Curated annotation (Swiss-Prot), chains A, B:
Belongs to the microviridae F protein family. Keywords: Capsid protein, T=1 icosahedral capsid protein, Viral genome ejection through host cell envelope, Viral penetration into host cytoplasm, Virion, Virus entry into host cell. It comes from Enterobacteria phage phiX174. InterPro entries: Capsid/spike_ssDNA_virus, Microviridae_protein_F, Microviridae_protein_F_sf. This is Capsid protein F. SUPFAM superfamilies: ssDNA viruses (SSF88645). One of its GO terms (biological process) is symbiont entry into host cell.
Swiss-Prot record, chains C, D:
Mediates ssDNA packaging into virion, it locates to the internal surface of the capsid, thereby displacing the internal scaffolding protein B during virion formation. Protein J binds to and is packaged with the viral ssDNA. Additionally, protein J plays a role in viral attachment efficiency to the host cell. One of its GO terms (cellular component) is viral capsid. Its main location: virion. It is found in: Virion; Host cytoplasm. Interacts with F protein. Disulfide bonds: none annotated. This is DNA-binding protein J. The lineage of its organism: Viruses, Monodnaviria, Sangervirae, Phixviricota, Malgrandaviricetes. Belongs to the microviridae J protein family.
Amino acid sequence: SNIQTGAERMPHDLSHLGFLAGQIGRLITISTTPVIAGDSFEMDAVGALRLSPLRRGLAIDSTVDIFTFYVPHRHVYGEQWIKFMKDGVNATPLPTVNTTGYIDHAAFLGTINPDTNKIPKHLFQGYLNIYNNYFKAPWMPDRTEANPNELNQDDARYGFRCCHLKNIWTAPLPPETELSRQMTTSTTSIDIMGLQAAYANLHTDQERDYFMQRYRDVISSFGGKTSYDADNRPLLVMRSNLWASGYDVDGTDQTSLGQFSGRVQQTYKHSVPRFFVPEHGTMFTLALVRFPPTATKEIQYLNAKGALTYTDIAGDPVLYGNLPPREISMKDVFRSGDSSKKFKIAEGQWYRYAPSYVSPAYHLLEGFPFIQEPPSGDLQERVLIRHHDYDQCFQSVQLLQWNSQVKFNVTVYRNLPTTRDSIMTS
Amino acid sequence: SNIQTGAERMPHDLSHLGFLAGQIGRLITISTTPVIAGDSFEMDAVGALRLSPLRRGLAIDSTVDIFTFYVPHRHVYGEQWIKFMKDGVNATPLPTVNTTGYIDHAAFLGTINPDTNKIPKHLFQGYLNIYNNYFKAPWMPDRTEANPNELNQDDARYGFRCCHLKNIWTAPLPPETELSRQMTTSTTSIDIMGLQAAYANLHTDQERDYFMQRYRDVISSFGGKTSYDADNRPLLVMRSNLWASGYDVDGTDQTSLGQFSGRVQQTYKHSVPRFFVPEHGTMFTLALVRFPPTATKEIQYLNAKGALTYTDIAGDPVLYGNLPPREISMKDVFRSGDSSKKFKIAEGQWYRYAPSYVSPAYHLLEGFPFIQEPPSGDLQERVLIRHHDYDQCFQSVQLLQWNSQVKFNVTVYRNLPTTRDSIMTS
Amino acid sequence: KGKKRSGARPGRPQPLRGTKGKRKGARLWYVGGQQF
Amino acid sequence: KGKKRSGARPGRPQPLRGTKGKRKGARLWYVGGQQF
DNA sequence: AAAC
DNA sequence: AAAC
DNA sequence: AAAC
DNA sequence: AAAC
């Protein structure tokens, strides 16, 4: 017998509908398309973004980010994948990670949990890589779970927590920033030349602390470049950002005349231009919905830290341009701030930033997506968004905090035989 | 104190002379330049290639290949390197491989052996990567030595053995090529549909055997591409190939009038166009000198394998286009061929190739670079060149079989401060 | 690599009308004949 | 990536004349003054 | 990483 | 029935 | 890897 | 002495 040895590349329509729902600061997978080496991929996601009904009228738009990343399988199975491709037909089948027995416990990967409880490891691992390289704060430790079953029900069902949009309190300098540096000197002399050197080393430290915690950044610093293969990072193909809005619904009965309900319907469109897939992998598309971090009790630093010194009030450039990072507490910027919770700020930061003001009349008023009490906890707990901080904002519904109905138009120019080349023996 | 935090990229002249010598089929390092992330590298190697004086006049030109590869350090220290860059100034110093106590025992890396006996592991490892990805036959096992001290004195001093230029005997199909394939059938029926499938699987096998033993090749087959980072391969930047020649010296004394000595002087030029170094690494430049594999006893297959069948003599395209690889012995193509040494050839190969003819009058005549007896040994020993097969060709000299005097013009556009920025405290 | 964001598609939402891509290609279903 | 070979530099060999590149740049040696 |  |  |  |  002679067999159908070739195939000619033709457009494959892998389009599908997406019925989505998530929480406010959690990263969730909304679509995934497995890709073959050599195919060309393009997508047009067009749908509507809705928030759960809110308790009063619209006050603030939320921002939406949609991302499409490419994760080669090699990146996920390493050596094992390489060998699989080489071994070919009799390669040992690929490893499968374990989920918790519930229908929504793999939802973070945008999938229904199979009854067996396992999924392809590349689906779980790709997600972790995406999170650890673009979403955790550079200084937090990577998420290193071996199987989805190690996750809480909120991480598993809704996706991992993302950081807030940058603030003085939301984006402090990295935890271990040094506020001083000693040079061991001799008892009655200092080496003028060693001192010089001392400064050169701290420099190098300081840069890694503030801008280069990641290997890829250290190289760019040298003016070199590093491939996504060099540090195994998911490649960001496309990203769309938008503000979702809508309209208020006027109540009209005897008791609710003078009352409104904000309806957020936002038409959006996520377009990924054609992309050449160099090796077999998954194409992950994720969504993140967030509100600006408006707390109902943030104070202006100068208004809440006692008596004002010359250094704090004068705006003297020689001072600000030359002294160490300032360690501050949650109490210097918040009404119920824990004085025990510290953070390092740049000197003069208070003159480079302005907090939003929420009159005290709004403090526990439901229907506003404001953070009601200052985040309590370690630096990490304060920068990671907590979806419950938004519970009193919406009407209670089964579709969490936001829901979307999208049409994923996706075309892949792949080269596999026709469905009938496939079902015909000859 | 304020320190010299920047530098401006300016041309660095890293030019140097090279006084070289090697054996005939061994790959040797002739120059190495350590590169920093972000520099631009360019080189103009211009010198003369000489062979040791030969015993009679010139008869055949040898061919010369000069190669320049780039090997990123990450490729060599992996994870350890990544961490080193991140750790910065207090990174743990990099590992150093061990050499044998002799002055020429690191010569294969184009260097004099330090008295301590160790060298940077990247220098030794880079060489192995280069060898294993472009020089061994795809089907031989990689060279996996941990330290240079595990090598024989000929590998260590002269470089590793390379394969001969392709021949019927020098380039047989890979050792494990299957000559048949069984499909387990039932006792009195065969599944017409399984058979079909059987053929699809063998196909996939066959391709990996003949053209895709390397992962990178399997992907190109899909029409995808793989970065040099994907499989860790040294990147080939430039390659020059040439035929070295010279002239005969006429003897003129009473006894040597009628006698000649071939003098091979070959001016050559190896030019590497500018190259952007993406990450810190070494730039390796190696030379390989080889002669076409002319044996003094190869016979034409049809003239040396008995009685001729229709399949062997007719050139019937339907036969050649359809039967398994033919297993042959060293005796079917050589006068003192070991009948016990087999090899798989393509059917009809004898009509696609013609051996060179050396009249028997030349058999043990010294001064001709001919292979005098057919290579004896396993497939691997026969394809790897053996420099001693050329000993009776040259006058015996201290500079081995070939010597070169080159001027490596190399310019690097790097960014490090000036030699005085460097020696001035302020 | 990723870039400009655009869900700013100014419009009232439209009910999802059809899960079949934008550009189709060869035939995918074989059921024995025509089936409406 | 590598390519065309060229040692075919048609010429009689010339003695190596000088180990100093093609394009130089800043000063490298400081010995206290001029030294021939 | 609004960088000698 | 994206068909020698 | 002179490839449906 | 590839120098504020």
